[PDB]
């Protein structure tokens, strides 16, 4: 067979240790899921420094906690705008997820609070910028570089899916690089906690699995498709399906004919054909062997999964740090005033935030 006694026992034991880990992780998650934290700071505790970008349904500002000097990334959601866009439940659920999950590659919610006008999610400041920026700056990542990031996403999805969470917005734009060069997943505005099938058309066009586009329902395997898209884009510098307009992108996704740059290794092409697989009886991450079909694939043969989790692997890129509160790794964005009405808006709809 492929493994002798020692290697087979080692792999078996590793796979059982993931099960034990996930069982404890679920216990911890459910306690926070059922009893969320609320109202852990207020706006005048923070100096507003600079806009870092956007997240679903809002804008993200670098802030400095006045009493400590610590910097954070604060997402500001305008309650009236959220109501108009029919995103009340999404925004409540994002905060509920963020305060309940705990994983080394998931951005942490350090504080949350609300006022008459807005909701505020104060997250860790991840100073290295978006993966998107670095990828577009250097064109494409080497396979070892892409694999280091991909491994973090594999582990993160293994964790999330064990909690019945589907992420649904994987893309380089949502992945931030921390000071040690590891990835932080942001934006749970499209995530859903559901067992089995769901139907919502949501996500980012280039990353949608065929079954999201089509009327049929879908499950967590859409995230494994999206991983395929991400790995392809990291290694190629462009995604596997693109076009001028989303409708044309969807046609290409549903057709599903993937082609690869000539520099892709055979191992990479094999993994991607198994992730970018229309047939759900064949897509990796959706089979009897679950996530192990991915983790044990030859393209990941050099990946020490525990060492990635423990953050003991040397990252391929360490972002420059100019000092506390430096934003040199970010684009500049329009600076919008934070206005707080003297009248409470939408109080009943956002009671749970």
């Amino acid at each position: 067979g492929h493994m002798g006694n020692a290697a087979a026992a080692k792999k078996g034991s590793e796979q059982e240790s993931v099960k034990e880990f996930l069982a404890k992780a679920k216990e911890e998650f459910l306690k926070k899921w059922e009893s969320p934290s609320q109202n852990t700071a207020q706006l005048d505790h923070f100096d507003r420094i600079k806009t870092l970008g956007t997240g679903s349904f809002g804008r993200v500002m670098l802030v400095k906690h006045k009493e400590t000097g610590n910097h954070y990334a604060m997402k500001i959601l305008d309650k009236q705008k959220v109501v108009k866009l029919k995103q009340i439940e999404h925004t409540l659920n994002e905060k509920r997820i963020l305060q309940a999950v705990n994983f080394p590659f998931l951005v942490k919610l350090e504080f949350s609070f609300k006022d008459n006008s807005n909701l505020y999610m104060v997250m860790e400041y991840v100073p290295g910028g978006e993966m998107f920026s670095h990828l577009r700056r250097i064109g494409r990542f080497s396979e070892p570089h892409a694999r280091f990031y991909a491994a973090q996403i594999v582990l993160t999805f293994e964790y999330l899916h064990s909690l019945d969470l589907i992420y649904r917005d994987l893309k380089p734009e949502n992945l931030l690089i921390d000071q040690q060069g590891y990835i932080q997943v942001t934006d749970f505005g499209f995530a859903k906690r559901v067992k089995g099938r769901t139907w919502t058309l949501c996500g980012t066009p280039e990353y949608l699995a065929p079954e999201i586009i089509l009327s049929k329902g879908y499950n967590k395997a859409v995230d494994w498709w999206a991983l395929g898209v991400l790995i392809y884009e990291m290694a190629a510098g462009y995604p596997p399906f693109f076009a001028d307009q989303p409708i044309q992108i969807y046609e290409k996704i549903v057709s599903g004919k993937v082609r690869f740059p000539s520099h892709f290794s055979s191992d990479l092409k094999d993994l991607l054909r198994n992730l970018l697989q229309v047939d759900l009886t064949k897509r990796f991450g959706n089979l009897k062997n679950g996530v192990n079909d991915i983790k044990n694939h030859k393209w990941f043969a050099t990946t020490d999964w525990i060492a990635i989790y423990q953050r003991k692997v040397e990252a391929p890129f360490i972002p420059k740090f100019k000092g506390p509160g430096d934003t040199s790794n970010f684009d500049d964005y329009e600076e919008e005033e934070i206005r707080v009405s003297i009248n409470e808006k939408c109080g009943k709809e956002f009671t749970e935030f």
Partner: peptide, 18 residues
């Protein structure tokens, strides 16, 4: 080339969710 097609697509910048 595929890369040139990508550059001509107008979708090389940040992509928003639907």
């Amino acid at each position: 080339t595929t890369y040139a097609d990508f550059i001509a697509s107008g979708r090389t910048g940040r992509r928003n969710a639907i």
